[PDB]
Amino acid sequence: LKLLDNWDSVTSTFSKLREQLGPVTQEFWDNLEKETEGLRQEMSKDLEEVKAKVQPYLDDFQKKWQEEMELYRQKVEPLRAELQEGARQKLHELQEKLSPLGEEMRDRARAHVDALRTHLAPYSDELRQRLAARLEALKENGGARLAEYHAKATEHLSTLSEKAKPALEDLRQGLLPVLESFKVSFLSALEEYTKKLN
Amino acid sequence: LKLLDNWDSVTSTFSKLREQLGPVTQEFWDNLEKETEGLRQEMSKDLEEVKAKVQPYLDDFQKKWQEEMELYRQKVEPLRAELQEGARQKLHELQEKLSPLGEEMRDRARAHVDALRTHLAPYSDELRQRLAARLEALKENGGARLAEYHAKATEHLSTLSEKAKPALEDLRQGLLPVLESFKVSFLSALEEYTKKLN
Ligand SMILES: CCCCCCCC/C=C\CCCCCCCC(=O)OC[C@H](COP(=O)(O)OCC[N+](C)(C)C)OC(=O)CCCCCCC/C=C\CCCCCCCC
Ligand SMILES: CCCCCCCC/C=C\CCCCCCCC(=O)OC[C@H](COP(=O)(O)OCC[N+](C)(C)C)OC(=O)CCCCCCC/C=C\CCCCCCCC
Ligand SMILES: CCCCCCCC/C=C\CCCCCCCC(=O)OC[C@H](COP(=O)(O)OCC[N+](C)(C)C)OC(=O)CCCCCCC/C=C\CCCCCCCC
């Protein structure tokens, strides 16, 4: 009955609020009407004058924009002409280098890579020797390491059997009564919660 | 209660671990010896050959570095001159643009700003006329709203006190017996809980 009576206090509040919301909206709408009414009178000024002035405003900016566009176009032509001539000259100077210095770079690259090839050839040969030596050393040792690891694993497993058998059985032998004692507490605890929560 | 039994089992596993550690580390060290010495067989040749590899490699790289460095002297240096003249030309091209177009942009700015002067000032003044009416409406509706809010405040306060009294009465009149009931449930709960956690 707690929530039932408490809800009544909430319901009455809603009723009181609803009876107040009426006048609230009535007066608020009334005040809003004056607000919008004023804004309407203002709209007949704001938009009216902004439209009456939008003509000379836009025409002014447009006129000047046209001048700006004309001036820009009157400049863009000779400017592009200068840029084009300059570009041709500058690009030509670049071509005067891309060709000789380009071939020079290619010719030097020939030597660069040729020396590299003549270096990589014996290098890789010796690298193969290194790999052969390293892999073989790691192989002979690898087999021993694997054999040793097998022994270590064998000893690990045999000792693990001291855990998988005795220790595990011991744990189970402990778990059994542990679970039983836990069952006792769990059973009573469940009764406890149920006795108080219901 | 049987933690001693479990702990002993853990102790046994620790001893078994040590029984492993001894032999395992012994052969592991023997393994490490094979690894260290084995790796040394590789490392000796590796390091010795590294000397016979890095020396002619740095030399080869230095040769290429010279070709590249000297190459850059016959490329970057003259190109710096080509680009210098090109930049100077471009700067001249730009200077002959930033001056006329620069003052032109300023003239445009003058025409736009002066326009904005007679476009923003008069408009803001008209906006002042509008804002005055807007604020006047807001002040009127605000004055009314202040009264409405004041009235509604008293109406809401009366409904609040009209609720607070009986609500607090019923709430306390509910809390009093409910607390006693809660105490009973809590006392029985605690009393029995300590019995299970005994
Ligand atoms: C059937 C279903 C029923 C439904 C349930 C309804 C029943 C609920 C019943 C009662 C609720 C009322 C709450 C208790 C009344 C508060 C009394 C009060 O005024 O108590 C203030 C104390 C703070 O101590 P003090 O400094 O005043 O005292 C030390 C004084 N010496 C240092 C200053 C001098 O507070 C305390 O006792 C309270 C604990 C500490 C308060 C810390 C402040 C917490 C603030 C905000 C938490 C907001 C979480 C929201 C964020 C979520 C984001 C997602
Ligand atoms: C239909 C169902 C609808 C849903 C229901 C909604 C729930 C509403 C009901 C209950 C809410 C539970 C909260 C009650 C807690 C008490 C608040 C209060 O009363 O605490 C008074 C104190 C006085 O200050 P002190 O230094 O002595 O206390 C400092 C003391 N210590 C440090 C312990 C805190 O205040 C403070 O602690 C800090 C507060 C400062 C307040 C300044 C007021 C400024 C004026 C106007 C702000 C307008 C807000 C508009 C929102 C409308 C609200 C109706
Ligand atoms: C201390 C005393 C404090 C005084 C407190 C004042 C309380 C008055 C305020 C609010 C009344 C709360 C009413 C709650 C009752 C439940 C109504 C209901 O049956 O609720 C459920 C419905 C439907 O579920 P749903 O649509 O939410 O879920 C959508 C999710 N799906 C689709 C999965 C279903 O929810 C809906 O109908 C959505 C309802 C959202 C409407 C909230 C009320 C907004 C009121 C005013 C807005 C302000 C206008 C002013 C601005 C004008 C400036 C000129």
Ligand SMILES: CCCCCCCC/C=C\CCCCCCCC(=O)OC[C@H](COP(=O)(O)OCC[N+](C)(C)C)OC(=O)CCCCCCC/C=C\CCCCCCCC
């Ligand atoms: C939420 C927490 C965030 C808080 C941050 C913001 C606070 C700052 C305060 C206010 C700024 C809010 C402005 C954004 C306006 C909301 C727009 C919106 O998201 O709206 C949604 C509503 C809901 O409906 P709907 O979208 O489902 O339907 C339309 C769809 N259809 C086609 C499907 C059926 O749309 C409607 O109610 C329909 C609208 C009908 C338009 C009528 C226009 C009448 C003309 C003039 C009125 C005069 C105003 C005077 C100026 C006074 C300024 C003080």
Ligand SMILES: CCCCCCCC/C=C\CCCCCCCC(=O)OC[C@H](COP(=O)(O)OCC[N+](C)(C)C)OC(=O)CCCCCCC/C=C\CCCCCCCC
């Ligand atoms: C007294 C009262 C006066 C005060 C007024 C002052 C303000 C007036 C200013 C702007 C209002 C615009 C008026 C609406 C009228 C038309 C709108 C419209 O439709 O005009 C169409 C245009 C063009 O479109 P079109 O390609 O079809 O025509 C191009 C076709 N030709 C090339 C192919 C041939 O469009 C446009 O002018 C669209 C430009 C606007 C861009 C909107 C997209 C926004 C995108 C994302 C929202 C991001 C929010 C970011 C938040 C972060 C903030 C930090």
Ligand SMILES: CCCCCCCC/C=C\CCCCCCCC(=O)OC[C@H](COP(=O)(O)OCC[N+](C)(C)C)OC(=O)CCCCCCC/C=C\CCCCCCCC
């Ligand atoms: C951990 C052992 C302790 C070592 C110490 C004692 C030594 C014992 C003696 C010898 C060791 C023998 C080594 C054998 C281990 C190889 C494991 C392996 O080959 O694994 C990779 C496999 C790959 O998957 P798949 O090809 O079989 O499946 C694909 C299935 N499809 C395609 C078929 C359907 O995965 C599997 O077999 C999944 C097996 C998941 C194993 C989870 C073990 C988590 C234990 C500890 C993590 C934390 C260590 C940090 C301790 C910090 C202490 C401070």
Ligand SMILES: CCCCCCCC/C=C\CCCCCCCC(=O)OC[C@H](COP(=O)(O)OCC[N+](C)(C)C)OC(=O)CCCCCCC/C=C\CCCCCCCC
């Ligand atoms: C002293 C200590 C001892 C010494 C130790 C060092 C030993 C290391 C040994 C050899 C180095 C080679 C490493 C990379 C292995 C792959 C070699 C190979 O078979 O590669 C083939 C690729 C394929 O290219 P494609 O022309 O057939 O395909 C063009 C296709 N389409 C046109 C559709 C775009 O060739 C490429 O990625 C390269 C061609 C693209 C050129 C890119 C620019 C590179 C910049 C500077 C030259 C750097 C030389 C340094 C070596 C690194 C090479 C990546």
Ligand SMILES: CCCCCCCC/C=C\CCCCCCCC(=O)OC[C@H](COP(=O)(O)OCC[N+](C)(C)C)OC(=O)CCCCCCC/C=C\CCCCCCCC
């Ligand atoms: C001892 C050895 C010395 C090494 C010296 C090397 C530098 C000396 C300079 C020049 C001569 C060597 C030339 C090597 C450069 C050419 C790389 C190349 O063959 O490029 C071709 C790619 C093709 O693109 P795609 O659209 O046809 O393929 C997209 C189509 N799909 C997706 C199907 C594949 O790119 C293009 O053609 C676009 C070209 C963009 C330019 C890339 C140049 C990158 C080089 C260096 C910048 C590094 C900055 C790192 C900073 C660290 C400093 C320590």
Ligand SMILES: CCCCCCCC/C=C\CCCCCCCC(=O)OC[C@H](COP(=O)(O)OCC[N+](C)(C)C)OC(=O)CCCCCCC/C=C\CCCCCCCC
């Ligand atoms: C239905 C509508 C009716 C109106 C309801 C009025 C009745 C009150 C009823 C219930 C309580 C509502 C809950 C208030 C919310 C708690 C806010 C809070 O947690 O507040 C304390 C915190 C703590 O920081 P602090 O105090 O050290 O810093 C203050 C900094 N200070 C000096 C620099 C400016 O403050 C902050 O987070 C900083 C924010 C402080 C803002 C103060 C606002 C001052 C404005 C006007 C004062 C008007 C009083 C007239 C009352 C009108 C009755 C009709």
Ligand SMILES: CCCCCCCC/C=C\CCCCCCCC(=O)OC[C@H](COP(=O)(O)OC[C@H](N)C(=O)O)OC(=O)CCCCCCC/C=C\CCCCCCCC
């Ligand atoms: C860590 C990230 C680095 C990224 C850098 C990106 C920027 C690239 C832009 C321009 C190229 C670099 C242009 C470098 C110009 C050198 C500028 C210079 O004087 O630098 C000095 C510093 C010294 O630092 P310290 O901390 O040692 O001492 C600071 C000192 N006390 C102080 O108060 O300043 O040394 C340095 O950091 C610079 C080392 C220069 C050695 C190599 C000089 C290069 C010479 C020739 C070029 C040959 C090109 C070879 C490459 C071809 C391809 C294979």
Ligand SMILES: CCCCCCCC/C=C\CCCCCCCC(=O)OC[C@H](COP(=O)(O)OC[C@H](N)C(=O)O)OC(=O)CCCCCCC/C=C\CCCCCCCC
């Ligand atoms: C009457 C029965 C009713 C039944 C109740 C059933 C439910 C019980 C469950 C929850 C209710 C308890 C709710 C307790 C809420 C505690 C709220 C609180 O103030 O917490 C703070 C403490 C802080 O401890 P620390 O004090 O040691 O502080 C030092 C801190 N680092 C510093 O620099 O200052 O944090 C801690 O409590 C944790 C560390 C505690 C250290 C001591 C830990 C000591 C723990 C146990 C005691 C020894 C066991 C003896 C055997 C008896 C059992 C048979």
